[PDB]
Amino acid sequence: PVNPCCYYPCQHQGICVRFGLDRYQCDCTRTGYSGPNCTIPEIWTWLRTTLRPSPSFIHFLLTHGRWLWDFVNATFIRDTLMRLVLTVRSNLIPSPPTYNIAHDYISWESFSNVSYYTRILPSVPRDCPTPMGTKGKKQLPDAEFLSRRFLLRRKFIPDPQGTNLMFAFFAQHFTHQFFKTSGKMGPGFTKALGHGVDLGHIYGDNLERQYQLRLFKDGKLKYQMLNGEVYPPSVEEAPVLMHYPRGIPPQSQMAVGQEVFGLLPGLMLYATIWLREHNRVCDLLKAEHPTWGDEQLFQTARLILIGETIKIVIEEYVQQLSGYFLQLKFDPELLFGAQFQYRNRIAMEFNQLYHWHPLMPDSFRVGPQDYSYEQFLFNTSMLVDYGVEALVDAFSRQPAGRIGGGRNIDHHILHVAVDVIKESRVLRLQPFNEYRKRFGMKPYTSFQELTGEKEMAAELEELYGDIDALEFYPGLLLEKCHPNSIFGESMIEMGAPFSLKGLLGNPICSPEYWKASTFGGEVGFNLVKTATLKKLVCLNTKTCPYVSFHVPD
Amino acid sequence: PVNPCCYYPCQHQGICVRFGLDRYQCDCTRTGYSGPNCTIPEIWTWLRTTLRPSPSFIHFLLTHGRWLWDFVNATFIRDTLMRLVLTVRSNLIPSPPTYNIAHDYISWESFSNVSYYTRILPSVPRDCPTPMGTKGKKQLPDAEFLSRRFLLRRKFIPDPQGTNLMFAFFAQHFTHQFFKTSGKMGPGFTKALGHGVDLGHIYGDNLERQYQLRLFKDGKLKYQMLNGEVYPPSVEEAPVLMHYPRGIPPQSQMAVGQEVFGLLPGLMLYATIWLREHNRVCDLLKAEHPTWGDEQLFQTARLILIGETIKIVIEEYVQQLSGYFLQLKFDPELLFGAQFQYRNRIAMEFNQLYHWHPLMPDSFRVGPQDYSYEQFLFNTSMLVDYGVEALVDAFSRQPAGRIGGGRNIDHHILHVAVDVIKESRVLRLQPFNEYRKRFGMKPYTSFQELTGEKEMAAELEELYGDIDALEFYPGLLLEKCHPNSIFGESMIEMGAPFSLKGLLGNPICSPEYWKASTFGGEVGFNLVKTATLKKLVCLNTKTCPYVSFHVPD
Ligand code: HEM
Ligand code: HEM
Ligand SMILES: *[C@@H]1O[C@H](CO)[C@@H](O[C@@H]2O[C@H](CO)[C@@H](O)[C@H](O)[C@H]2NC(C)=O)[C@H](O)[C@H]1NC(C)=O
Ligand SMILES: *[C@@H]1O[C@H](CO)[C@@H](O[C@@H]2O[C@H](CO)[C@@H](O)[C@H](O)[C@H]2NC(C)=O)[C@H](O)[C@H]1NC(C)=O
Ligand SMILES: *[C@@H]1O[C@H](CO)[C@@H](O[C@@H]2O[C@H](CO)[C@@H](O)[C@H](O)[C@H]2NC(C)=O)[C@H](O)[C@H]1NC(C)=O
Ligand SMILES: *[C@@H]1O[C@H](CO)[C@@H](O[C@@H]2O[C@H](CO)[C@@H](O)[C@H](O)[C@H]2NC(C)=O)[C@H](O)[C@H]1NC(C)=O
Ligand SMILES: Cc1cnc(NC(=O)C2=C(O)c3ccccc3S(=O)(=O)N2C)s1
Ligand SMILES: Cc1cnc(NC(=O)C2=C(O)c3ccccc3S(=O)(=O)N2C)s1
Ligand SMILES: *[C@@H]1O[C@H](CO)[C@@H](O)[C@H](O)[C@H]1NC(C)=O
Ligand SMILES: *[C@@H]1O[C@H](CO)[C@@H](O)[C@H](O)[C@H]1NC(C)=O
């Protein structure tokens, strides 16, 4: 007997449940629908859906008519839409979290064991005919061949939005505080138990690591002086597990919150920047609170930095990324009138989705120099040789690659993509179209409709056999881009909910935490409120380089 | 220079922050007040505070005019009031949690490290004149003397509400799933990382223990057959850490979710009850879903028992506790329209508050028999000798002591109270009056006013020296009861919010979880919705005893 749930019968987020030997029932509770498969809509649901403009139209709106938007932005409407934007997106994401790699059903273990990633759609049942459920072939396309054919970069395709490598290294650095898959526990498990913006890539995912990183004087982090400039300490002075290539001595390793940040100078750039910021904040705080001890200064500084990070990520990172003419605003108070849970759980689909490897260029231009991947990867002196100002200037001037559209991953790192697909198959992720429906979009009817061309569409059709068997991450990276945009609609409509749920779902964004007292007073509160990229860099440097998420022209 | 925060200057939940070398500022944000000490009310606050009757009045209302209430209970006014009460009560408890033993300010460590109990009020600063702040003597009254003088039971004072020992062991069993202070980490730390109704006192507070407890067949837990009856397995079959007296044979040690439950026959009684309920539920589940694996059966059964637990606690336990004519109701949907955080962090004050040892009698009568503490404590055969029915009936018939009033703790266990006071001094809890104010009550102006009598009042006045120096637990246990009640107004006004948050803050109460599919369909859902103590016991027994939370007429 075939598992009926393999047909994914229940629509509109209805929960398929197995009854008896060969029967199923759909839990249609609070879906807005009724019927055998949650297909019969209610009043307001029908009104809502029939009056819903397509995401493409909305995107068009947000990206055109600079007049209208320069007006809107200067009025309360900004907040209004923002709030709307806030309330509509977050709701897509189940909170408290639902399933994980072990349970395709709600369970107490799924809730209490934060060692798991969560998931939005349950896995493909193991007793299913084809790997992706019902459609497709007996064996999924070869991962390697797939990547080589459709994801491998031939000629470099720059991001049409002007995104630079400053953005890229910020994205990598930032996301690697909640994307930390456990190699010992395997796919579906994580070491970043903060499940959000806890800045564990600065202070460590665990207490002992944190303590080894701390000066325990004035709340500050350990550091070393080189050429008159502050840098992370060595593993010698801060005995912390760093993942370096063997043969490199603890004397030559720098210690930071994330074990892998030594493998790239952009990463260690951001570690350096945030370290300096932390200690500078500590200085402000101690100036304001002479009676405070090390602990309170450290903790408060950490809070301020979390606020600053959320503030900048929203008002500049996601800004640049979105290309919206609507000015995005970080203000927790907008949710103080809403039904919002301040908790976050990193999803596996979010992990898969954020593999923005096409961003990385062919080489790395630093001034008149051009360093290859071998020169750049695992380079242990570049940061110290050039300094922060220079690398920030350089990265901010060099453009990143377009994420969506296909054929734009440098061959040096294509293997990652391969592995992603493979992990997707171990994680038994549902097909792309299922996730499409899951985030409020119509499923595609053909590969042509996905790619917007015919060649790749034809060959993909050859490989998969059915569009309903197209895999999630391939689907994201091969989908046609919005006009002049950095990726397609799926990347946005799937990524945005996770993104803002993780940003605003942070406890500091709660009525309980969002106070001056929490940040040591008005000075800290303002540090959070007025945080920009430019300030974050220049306030901790001697000189001020070009600092921006986009190229200067 | 004296710490100004020692004077507790900040009013109405304002946050005192130490500025400069001898200054302070109050964070008055969203308190409803303004001014230096947050003493200047906003218009709506003022209005609200003028129209608000006292807690005693509300108590009178809830405890008089059975007619009016019998009308309200047959209407939607029940739901309206219940919702009112829910909102109002829950808004007192900070969510996300604020402070812990290490941190008297908001920190990321206090949010993320769930090994800590939380606290509503910060500790008395370590740089204060008197132990309680600025009032009282340099030394607190001797805990032992305090206990002997004001807590030692002379004559047994039965609870005027009709409470039995079935209730007492229920309260103990139930609350020991989230009260598990760490003997190794010390005061202010917990092993129950669940921080709520997770039923770890059945399944274990860690995964390893859980697995050792599980049959891994059909979702059930291991068990043993004695005299044709089902009991928890022996340690020999389920090798887990249980705290038994050295010398007791392993085949005489039953393995349950909570390590200390072998020390009392009441505890092991309830443990047995819940075990049988779990396996029975599994029978129902598997009958409904033959294709299900042991894991899914287990997890679903667990969630069902959690639901039944909150159901019974709210509609019968708390009902008997409060004595309200308002029939309380467990309905998560009452909160679907409001702003509520489905998370809980066990507060240390809640721990202290819930020390209801006066409930325990002088002896434990079982039918014609009457056992002593030396016969009842650590008795490892009593439960099997009498059986479930017999013990349930027995405990249901024998009365329990009144909690409030004073001088009603049996001398066998009085030491506990001593150790509590001591710990309250370790925890540096604020004085009774500060917590009174924190929970929307007016501070007591004398011990006279507190006790309602003159003897205890005068001696207490001599010992403490000032009313504003009266400690938390002493104030709770010595405060005059409501007319014919089991305790006074403080035990209710501080106990209610915590309890409330603990029950409804459970993620199963969430709109995300509160679906039939979560409980394996209509059947499981109905089990939760119609759960009953009477049913809990009699459905798993052979014969049906007297089972209730109050003595018969
Ligand atoms: C030279 C630049 C980069 C290199 C060498 C690199 C390499 C890698 C490698 C080797 C992994 C682990 C793969 C595995 O263990 O199978 C990884 C993971 C990942 N990378 Fe990249 N990457 C680069 C840039 C980026 C950028 C710019 C992003 C932007 C978001 C990114 C996103 C991710 C994500 C989301 C993961 C998953 C991490 C986890 O699951 O814990 N990478 N990368
Ligand atoms: C024969 C009956 C009882 C005995 C022998 C007993 C004994 C004890 C003992 C020895 C402790 C630990 C004290 C320490 O470690 O210093 C304790 C703690 C405690 N007791 Fe009882 N008790 C009894 C009844 C009850 C009841 C009916 C309740 C109902 C609420 C209760 C509530 C508590 C609580 C909440 C704790 C704190 C546990 C923790 O923080 O981990 N006790 N009791
Ligand atoms: C969270 O779940 C994981 C997965 O079950 C737990 O790790 C497992 O522990 C069991 C029993 O202790 C072992 O048999 C498995 O080998 C473990 N699995 C893996 C992949 O390591 C983990 O202990 C749980 N975490 C908590 C805090 O309970
Ligand atoms: C790491 O990067 C540094 C740059 O800081 C590289 O050093 C430069 O590389 C070439 C020499 O072959 C020239 O551009 C410069 O003369 C070097 N600059 C300095 C300051 O020495 C270095 O080659 C890289 N290291 C590795 C192992 O690739
Ligand atoms: C939660 O906090 C406690 C207290 O800080 C941690 O326990 C301490 O850990 C440090 C370093 O690991 C030790 O030096 C202390 O002796 C420990 N104190 C106690 C009382 O155990 C605990 O590890 C933290 N837990 C988590 C998960 O972070
Ligand atoms: C544990 O409780 C049992 C009851 O199950 C006690 O055994 C009974 O003791 C009384 C004495 O007061 C006798 O009259 C009964 O005949 C006994 N019943 C049985 C079945 O033996 C026992 O004394 C208690 N054990 C301890 C160590 O105190
Ligand atoms: C590929 C993407 C990853 N994350 C994206 N996020 C957004 O599109 C998005 C936000 O993340 C967000 C953050 C804070 C407030 C509001 C928004 S958003 O409207 O959901 N939007 C731009 S898009
Ligand atoms: C001494 C007390 C300990 N716990 C108490 N709880 C109540 O007074 C109380 C509840 O616990 C509660 C539970 C569920 C819904 C509503 C209520 S309540 O209104 O806060 N109330 C009776 S009183
Ligand atoms: C519901 O789904 C099942 C399986 O896909 C199908 O047999 C049935 O016809 C569907 N009914 C409706 C109304 O969509
Ligand atoms: C505020 O409280 C402090 C401490 O009790 C007191 O000294 C001060 O006079 C108060 N100020 C006002 C304006 O009430």
Distance CA B522, CA B519 (A): 8
Beta strands in B147-249 (DSSP E): 224-226, 229-231
Which value, to the nearest 10 degrees, does the dihedral of the CA atoms of residues A224, A229, A232, A238 take?
0
Q: Which amino acid is at A142?
A: D
Contacting residues for B389 by C-beta, under 8 A, at least 6 apart: B541, B542, B543, B544, B545
Burial of residue A228 (CB within 10 Å: 0-12, 13-18, 19+) is: exposed
Residues A48, A37 within the same domain: no
Q: How far is ligand 5, taken at its centre, from the CA of residue A263, in Å?
A: 30
Nearest ligand, measured from the Cα of B375: 6
Cα-Cα-Cα-Cα dihedral sign, residues A357, A363, A365, A366? positive
What is the amino acid identity at position A145? F
E strands, B51-147, where?
A: none
Q: How far apart are CA B351 and CA B305, in angstroms?
A: 24
Distance from CA of B511 to the nearest CA of A (A): 8
Residues of A in contact with B21 (CB under 8 A): 290-291
For residue B346, give its domain range.
43-552
Residues facing B152 on adjacent strands: B409
- Provide CB contacts within 8 A for B506, sequence distance 6+: B196, B197, B306, B310, B342, B344
Maximal C-alpha separation, chain A: 73
Residues in chain A, total? 553
Contacts of B67 (CB under 8 A, 6+ apart): none
Token pair 């994580």 in the structure block, residue: A190
B40-41/B33-34 β-pairing: antiparallel
Instruction: Write out B331-400 in H/E/C secondary structure.
Output: CHHHHCCCCCCCCCCCEHHHHHHCCCHHHCCCCEEECCEEECHHHHCCCCCHHHHHCHHHHHHHHHHCEC
What gap in Å lies between CA B30 and CA A515, rounded to an integer?
Answer: 9
Distance, CA B158 to ligand 3 centroid (Å)?
48
Minimal-distance CA residue to ligand 8 atom 20? B496
Q: Decide if A20 and B302 are in contact by the 8 Å CB cutoff.
A: no
Provide the 8-state DSSP code for B473. Answer: H
- Determine the distance in angstroms separating the CA of B238 from the nearest CA of chain A, rounded to an integer: 21
The number of the ligand nearest the C-alpha atom of A259 reads 1
- Please tell me chain B's helix, strand, coil percentages from 3-state DSSP, rounded to the nearest 5: 45, 10, 45
Residue tagged 């400039």 (tokens): A229
Q: Which residues line ligand 10 (CB under 6 A)?
A: B 7, 9, 36-37, 39
Beta bridge partners of B163: B550
Token reading at A414? 């294509």
Shortest CA distance to B299 belongs to which of A119, A108, A17?
Answer: A108
* Ligand 6 atom index nearest CA of B374: 28
Beta bridge partners of B164: B399
Q: Is the peptide bond before B96 cis (omega within 30 degrees of 0)?
A: yes
- The verdict on the CB of residue A335 being under 6 Å from ligand 1 is no
- C-alpha Rg value of chain B to the nearest Å: 24
d(CA B29, CA B39): 12
Residues from chain B contacting residue A94 (CB–CB below 8 Å): 512
For ligand 5, atom 17: residue with the closest CA: B185
Q: CB-based burial of residue B17 (10 Å sphere; 0-12 exposed, 13-18 middle, 19+ buried)? A: buried
Half-sphere exposure of B76 (CA within 13 A, CB side): 1
**Cα(A553)–Cα(B17) distance, integer angstroms:** 47
> Which residue has the CA at smallest separation from atom 7 of ligand 7?
A496
DSSP notation for A217-282: STTPBP-EEETTEEEPPBTTTS-------TT--GGGPBP-SSTTGGG-HHHHHHHHHHHHHHHHHH
C-beta of residue A91 within 8 angstroms of C-beta of residue A78: no
A86-110 burial code (b ≥16 CB/10 A, e <16)? beebbebbbbbbbbbbebbbbbbbb
Name B45's Cβ contacts closer than 8 Å, sequence gap at least 6: B32, B33
- Find residue B229's DSSP bridge partners: B226
Closest CA to A441 of A132, A52, A87, A95: A52
| Angle between helical axes of A489-504 and A55-62 (0-180°, round to 10) | 70
Please tell me whether residues A13 and A69 are part of one structural domain.
no
B41 sits in which H/E element: strand B40-41
What residues in A contact B299, CB-CB < 8 Å? 103, 105, 107-110
Is A517 within 8 Å of B105 when comparing Cβ atoms? Answer: yes
Same domain, yes or no: B356 and B261: yes
Domain shared by B293 and B391, yes or no: yes
User: Could you tell me which of B349, B354, B432, B343 has the C-alpha nearest to residue B101?
Assistant: B349
Tokens of B254: 């039953």
**Cis before residue A94, ω within 30 degrees of 0?**
no
Query: A240, A284, A223: which is closest to A522 by C-alpha?
Result: A284
d(CA A341, CA A338): 9
* Of the partner residues A113, A288, A343, the one whose CB lies closest to the CB of residue B343: A343
Is the Cβ atom of B382 under 6 angstroms away from ligand 6?
A: yes
Cα–Cα nearest to B152, from B478, B506, B370, B482: B478
Q: How many CB atoms lie within 10 A of CB A486?
A: 27
Extract the tokens encoding B334.
Answer: 């009452």
Residues in the annotated binding site of A for heme b: 357
Q: What single DSSP character describes residue A337?
A: T
Q: Which residues contact A219 (CB under 8 A, 6 or more apart)?
A: A282, A285, A286, A292, A294, A295, A296, A297, A298, A299, A300, A301
Residue A13 is which amino acid?
A: Q
Q: Which residues of B touch A339 (CB under 8 A)?
A: 338-339
CB-CB contact of A173 with A275 (8 Å): no
Query: Is B517 in contact with A29 (Cβ distance < 8 A)?
Result: yes
The CA-atom distances, in angstroms, between A465 and each of A296, A387, A490, B183 are: 60, 52, 21, 62
Same domain, B227 and B140: yes
Instruction: Give φ, ψ of B534 to 5 degrees.
Output: -50, -50
CB A317 within 8 A of CB A549: yes
Q: Are residues A13 and A132 in the same domain?
A: no
Can you tell me the distance from the alpha carbon of A202 to that of A387, in angstroms, rounded to the nearest whole number? 19
- Kindly report the number of other CB atoms within 10 A of residue B106's CB atom: 24
Task: Please give the Cα distance from B76 to B85 (Å, whole number).
Answer: 14
Residue B130's DSSP bridge partners are B133
Q: β-pairing, B224-226 with B229-231? A: antiparallel
Distance CA A350, CA A310 (A): 18
What CATH number did the domain enclosing B510 receive? 1.10.640.10
Q: Which residue does chain B place closest to A17, by CA atoms?
A: B517
Q: Are B193 and B206 in contact (CB under 8 A)?
A: no
Question: CA A230, CA B224: separation in Å to the nearest integer?
Answer: 66
* Cα pseudo-dihedral B261, B263, B264, B269, rounded to 10: 40
Identity of the residue in B17, B198, B342 whose CB atom sits nearest the CB atom of A96: B342
Report how far Cα A259 is from the mean position of its chain's Cα atoms. Answer: 19
* Residue bearing tokens 């040591």: A520
Q: Extract the tokens encoding A96.
A: 């408290």
CATH code, domain with B16: 2.10.25.10
Under a CB-based contact definition with an 8 Å cutoff, are residues A150 and A251 in contact? no
Distance from CA of A550 to the nearest CA of B (A): 32
User: How was this structure obtained?
Assistant: X-ray
From the CB of residue B27, how many other CB atoms can be counted at a distance below 10 Å? 20
How many Å apart are CA A437 and CA A415, to the nearest integer? Answer: 29
Question: Which among A511, A437, A505, A494 has a CA at the least distance from the CA of A89?
Answer: A494
Q: Are residues B238 and B312 in the same domain?
A: yes
| Closest among A316, A268, A363, A340 to A502, alpha carbons compared | A340
- Smallest CA–CA distance, residue B101 to chain A, in Å, is 13
What count of Cα atoms within 13 Å lies in the side-chain half-sphere of residue A245? 6
Separation between Cα atoms, residue B487 and residue B478, nearest integer Å: 9
**Is A517 close to B17, i.e. CB distance below 8 A?**
yes
| Same domain assignment for residues B36 and B107 | no
B163 phi, psi to nearest 5 deg: -55, 135
- CA distances to A397, A405, A412, B107 from A167, rounded to whole Å, are 11, 19, 20, 29
Of B200, B190, B198, the residue nearest B257 (C-alpha)? B200
| Paired residues of B231 in beta bridges | B224
Q: Which of A107, A288, A290 sits opposite B299 (nearest CB)?
A: A107
Residue A494: closest CA among A351, A370, A384: A351
Residues in chain A preceding a C-to-N separation beyond 2.5 angstroms (breaks): none
Q: Looking at the structure, do residues A36 and A73 belong to the same domain, yes or no?
A: no
Give, rounded to a whole angstrom, the gap between the first and last alpha carbons of chain B: 63
Tell which residue, A490, A165, A404, A291, has the closest CA to residue B16.
A291
| Lookup result for tokens 């951001």 | A270
Sole residue written with tokens 């003597």: B137
CA A258 to chain centre: 16
Cα–Cα distance between B115 and B348 in angstroms, integer?
A: 12
Number of Cβ atoms within 10 Å of the Cβ of B330: 21
Q: Which residue has the tokens 């391939």?
A: A474
CA angle (B345 as vertex; B344, B348 as ends), nearest 5 = 140
Residues of B recognised as catalytic: 176, 354
How far apart, in whole angstroms, are the C-alpha atoms of residue B290 and residue B297?
A: 10
Size of interface A-B (CB pairs under 8 A): 138
Cβ pair A195, A352 in contact under 8 A:
no
* A348 Cα–ligand 7 center, Å: 18
The CA distances from residue B36 to B11, B25, B28, B32, B134, in Å, are 9, 7, 9, 13, 20
Of residues B260, B165, B157, B154, the one with CA closest to residue B204: B260
Tell me how far apart the alpha carbons of residues B232 and B215 are, in angstroms, rounded to a whole number: 12
Helix (H) or strand (E) holding A26: strand A23-27
Helix A489-504 to helix A77-90 angle (10° resolution) is: 100
Phi-psi region of A274 (alpha: psi -120 to 50; beta: other; left: phi over 0): alpha
> Does residue B207 have its Cβ closer than 6 Å to ligand 3?
yes
Burial A354-379 (b: 16+ CB within 10 A, else e): bbbbbbbbeebebeeeeeebeebeeb
Helix (H) or strand (E) holding B17: strand B15-19
* Residue of B26, B98, B101, B291 to mutate, interface with A, max A Cβ within 10 Å: B291
B328 neighbors B319 (Cβ within 8 angstroms): yes
Q: How far is CA B390 from CA B139, B165, B166, in A?
A: 50, 13, 12
Q: Alpha-carbon distance A497 to A319, whole Å?
A: 15
Report the C-alpha gap between A311 and A304 in whole angstroms: 10
Element (H, E) at B225: strand B224-226
Residue B18, H or E segment: strand B15-19
- Cβ partners under 8 Å of residue B131, min gap 6: B124, B138, B139, B140, B425, B428, B469
Which residues are B17's β-sheet partners? B25
Number of domains present in the structure of chain A: 2
**Bridge partners, A364 (sequence order):** A371
User: Cβ atoms within 10 A of the Cβ of A483, count?
Assistant: 10
**Given resolution (angstroms):** 2.4
Three-state DSSP class for residue A375: helix
Ramachandran category for residue B12: left, alpha or beta (phi over 0 → left; psi -120 to 50 → alpha): left
Same domain, B176 and B28: no
B287 CB-contact burial (10 Å; exposed 0-12 / middle 13-18 / buried 19+): exposed
A517 lines ligand 4 (CB under 6 A): no
d(CA A255, CA A240): 6
Q: B71 and B101 in one domain?
A: yes
Least Cα distance to A112 among B361, B258, B343, B109 occurs for B343
* β partners of residue B545: none
Rounded to the nearest 5°, which phi and psi values hold at B25?
-140, 145
Whether residues A90 and A21 fall in one domain = no
